[PDB]
Design a protein around this nucleic acid. Structure first.
Ligand SMILES: [K+]
Ligand SMILES: [K+]
Ligand SMILES: [K+]
Ligand SMILES: [K+]
Ligand SMILES: [Mg+2]
Ligand SMILES: [Mg+2]
Ligand SMILES: [Mg+2]
Ligand SMILES: [Mg+2]
Ligand code: NA
Ligand code: NA
Ligand code: NA
Ligand code: NA
Lengths: 122, 140, 260, 178
RNA sequence: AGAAAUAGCUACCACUUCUACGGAGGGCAGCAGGCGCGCAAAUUGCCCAAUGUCGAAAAAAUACGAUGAGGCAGCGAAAAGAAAUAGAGCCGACCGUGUGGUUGUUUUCAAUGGGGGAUACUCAAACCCAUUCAAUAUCGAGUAACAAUUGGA
RNA sequence: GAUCUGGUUGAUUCUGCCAGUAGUCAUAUGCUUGUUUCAAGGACUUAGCCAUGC
């Protein structure tokens, strides 16, 4: 029958010049939507709402689906430019996009060598 | 009537302390002699080893043989007599096995027409005597 | 020599949830007491939601963006107390720490001229080596040459950007005070009288603006001015007037109904 | 282990387990409201006992008492709004006269049947558990929901339900795929 | 600065490990795990994302502080809160009572979750919830074998 | 919820204790267990003995 659309609204708003960002709460209305709605679709729509050059300046996380309904609420961050986004965003959030630091060795091995090198000098 | 003082709380406190030793229920919970004489050191159940199977007669108006066993406890090596319930159920006991023993009710008082027996057999070889009776399990 | 502070043992006015974490930031020693203050990490992360996590407050405080007495502070666990000006020059907002009518911390936006003024309460007057009269203050400041009329209970109006004393407000019946401890914290009223009780705690009897009467220990009043109008600083919304609990409940109920 | 969550109990078994008079009165309530177990009745017993106990304490207090005025208004506000007491009764003495079916009348399983959306009192429970009823355009699937006075006219079918304007249900879909 | 500190030192007493027999060590009532004891009690897991402490430290790069404190998941009817195991009728056979509930025999007719799968959400990474069986476009009870027990008369 | 019942006599009215009855974030054992939320978990006896890693 009918098509499935998505509408995005922002209830609370705040401008953060200390961390070069603006914060808000995202509301998504998706009546008739099948399944959930991936976060990249929100990023497209939020970019339309506040026209940004690069959609990667937008961050969305912590989204909860309302019981027995077609609503979903999450948090949202907007950065002035990509340079500020890289500096301030936590690593695991950048890795979600696919552009964070590679990896680190298992923590067990690191603390194993730390005690081993306590028996030796130089 | 009795003392009605408004400054006589000392006399009323002493009276209640002295007279509270006169009821057997309150005395049993504050005297430590019951725990020592009790084969279970104040515990719900205890584990023991079967020594032999005995048959004790019932009291006078009744007439039967009550099919008990003689059990030596493990935690303190005391000897007690315990009753094995339900029909049959003696063939599931055997000799030198290890059993779990519980009270009979009434907290140390003998029960029914069995003379001087206040313990019952619950588990044999750690399976469950009633489960064996209902065939829900097999003897290891 | 403790270094932690369990959540449940923290002051209630920080309003930290008991379901979020086990610990709280212990305020380092300094101008104000541990019980009678709130730290800079609390203000940045809990009062104004500039920072979400506690790592972000470091990203603000370690740069010296926040100032607390005209000097930027980099320590999150800095103790900030009553009558303190907090200004963030990048954002342009300045708050003064005061007590609201219910005895809780209140941050009220002040003007540019006001942000350079601070009120202090004398607690001790002594002599230094040589003959230097120096007076200690409720926030720990020491003033080298005060007015020779200063005494224990009075208050001083202080310029923070440049260190000097503006004027001294003594104690007496006419003046108006604000209660700073004892479940009457956050009430403004005049001094009806003060009772001596030598060797023990003096009792000061005060009259509210609405004609009510209340009393408290004399070590809990902070004289603001000689009149309500002549206040060097700004004041919170209610002006320290408390009203009946049933009236509070009823006004809240009807106000919600007209709102929707 | 270092947790600070809370929990409590909502019901209580009655003394004297077998009284023929109480057994029949409770059975009558169950088979006529279509309840599942006696615990549902015994929940109503304790919530009733709490309002009665606080009303009794307040009524003992003298009039114009500050505690009496504030709490007295609060309990009447809850009782009127929830639909336990009609708006004419306002003296705080009509609280004690509350009985069990008065609270059981406000249950969402009951109110659905009264409005006529169901053919019985057990049909309505099945409908509620299967995500068909919406109170204020929000789907509610818990029979013990106690309907407020300002929400009876908003009760209707849910959009997502096949009986509303939703897609065909399980039987229709599997018949089409057959 | 602060200890008469146990993942600081010294000795004696009880048990105890390696050795080339000259000697040298050990302290789980910290975390997980084993033996014994008993009626009686969980994995030799992942992580610094949150909460904090310490520090010569904000974050970012030609450049990632530690942390079994802490948190997360595995086992878990201690206990506590919600809650399925069916709803409407059809046609005979009826049961009582005076024509209105009812008790099986045939038989349609919708609805829904145990079950399984993602455009995917969560998550520090995985899991559980919460959404959804087309949005051109997505699986499924009928002797509902998807079968309620434990105690009694 | 400010509640009681069975046993002394050929019957009756008592004192009085045995037995019944409801709970317990109170422990253990037995039988039986589809879903979900929140959760305590080697105190009890032996402040007994401890391989290995942190
Ligand atoms: K020591
Ligand atoms: K251990
Ligand atoms: K079943
Ligand atoms: K029988
Ligand atoms: Mg150790
Ligand atoms: Mg256990
Ligand atoms: Mg006699
Ligand atoms: Mg122990
Ligand atoms: Na209320
Ligand atoms: Na030692
Ligand atoms: Na950390
Ligand atoms: Na934890």
């Amino acid at each position: 029958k009918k098509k499935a659309e998505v509408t995005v609204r922002t209830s609370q708003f705040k401008v953060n010049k200390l961390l070069n960002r603006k914060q808000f709460v995202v509301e998504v209305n998706h009546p008739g939507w099948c399944g959930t709605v991936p976060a990249k679709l929100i990023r497209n729509r939020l970019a339309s709402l506040y026209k940004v050059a690069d959609e990667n300046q937008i961050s969305v996380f912590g989204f909860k689906t309302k019981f027995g309904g077609g609503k979903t609420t999450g948090f949202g961050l907007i950065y002035d430019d990509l340079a500020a986004m890289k500096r301030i965003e936590p690593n695991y959030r950048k890795a979600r996009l696919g552009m964070g630091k590679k990896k680190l060795p298992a923590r067990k091995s690191v603390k194993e060598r730390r005690n081993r090198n306590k028996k030796i000098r130089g | 009537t009795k003392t009605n003082g408004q400054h006589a709380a000392r006399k009323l406190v002493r009276l209640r302390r002295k007279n509270r030793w006169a009821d057997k229920g309150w005395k049993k919970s504050h005297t430590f002699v019951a725990q020592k004489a009790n084969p279970f050191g104040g515990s719900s159940h205890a584990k023991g080893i079967v020594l032999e199977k005995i048959g004790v007669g019932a009291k006078q108006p009744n007439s039967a043989i009550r099919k008990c066993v003689r059990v030596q406890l493990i935690k303190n090596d005391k000897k007690i007599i315990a009753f094995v319930p339900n029909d049959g159920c003696l063939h599931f006991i055997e000799e030198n096995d290890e059993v779990l023993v519980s009270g009979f009710g009434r907290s140390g008082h003998a029960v029914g027409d069995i003379p001087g027996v206040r313990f019952k057999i619950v588990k044999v070889s750690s399976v469950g005597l009633y489960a064996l009776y209902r065939q829900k399990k097999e003897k290891p | 020599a403790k270094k932690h502070l369990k959540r449940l043992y923290a002051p209630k006015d920080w309003m930290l949830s008991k379901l979020t974490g086990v610990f709280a930031p212990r305020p380092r020693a300094g101008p104000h007491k541990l019980r009678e203050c709130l730290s800079l990490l609390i203000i940045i992360r809990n009062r104004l939601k500039y920072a979400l996590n506690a790592l972000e407050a470091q990203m603000i405080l370690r740069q010296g963006l926040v100032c607390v007495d005209g000097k930027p502070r980099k320590d999150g666990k800095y103790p900030a107390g009553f009558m303190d000006v907090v200004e963030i020059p990048k954002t342009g907002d300045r708050f003064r720490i005061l007590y609201d009518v219910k005895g809780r911390f209140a941050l009220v936006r002040v003007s540019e001229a006001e942000s350079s003024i601070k009120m202090m309460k004398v607690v001790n007057v002594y002599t230094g080596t040589g003959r230097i009269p120096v007076a200690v203050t409720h926030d720990g400041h020491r003033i080298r040459y005060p007015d020779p009329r200063t005494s224990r209970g009075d208050t001083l109006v202080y310029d923070v950007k440049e260190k000097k004393v503006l004027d001294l407000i003594k104690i007496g019946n006419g003046k108006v005070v604000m209660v700073t401890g004892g479940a009457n914290r956050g009430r403004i009223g005049e001094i009806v009288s003060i009772e001596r009780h030598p060797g023990a705690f003096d009792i000061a009897r005060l009259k509210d603006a609405s004609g009510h009467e209340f009393a408290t220990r004399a070590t809990n009043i902070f004289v603001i001015g000689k009149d309500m109008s002549s206040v060097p600083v700004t004041l919170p919304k209610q002006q320290g007037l408390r009203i009946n609990v049933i009236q509070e409940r009823e006004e809240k109920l009807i106000a919600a109904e007209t709102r929707r | 282990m270092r947790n600070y969550n809370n929990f409590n109990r909502v019901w209580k078994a009655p003394r004297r387990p077998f009284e023929k008079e109480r057994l029949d009165r409770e059975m009558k309530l169950c088979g006529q409201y279509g309840l599942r177990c006696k615990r549902e009745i015994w929940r109503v017993n304790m919530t009733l006992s709490k309002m009665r106990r606080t009303a009794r304490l307040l009524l003992t207090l003298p009039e114009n008492h500050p505690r009496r005025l504030l709490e007295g208004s609060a309990i009447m506000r809850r009782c009127h709004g929830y639909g336990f007491l009609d708006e004419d009764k306002d003296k705080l003495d009509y609280v004690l006269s509350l009985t069990v079916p008065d609270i059981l009348e406000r249950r969402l399983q009951t109110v659905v049947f009264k409005h006529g959306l169901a053919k019985s009192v057990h049909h309505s429970r099945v409908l509620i558990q299967q995500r068909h009823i919406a109170v204020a355009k929000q789907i509610v699937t818990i029979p013990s929901f106690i309907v407020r006075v300002s929400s009876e006219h908003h009760i209707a079918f849910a959009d997502a339900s096949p009986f509303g304007n939703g897609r065909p249900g399980r039987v229709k879909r599997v018949k089409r795929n057959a």
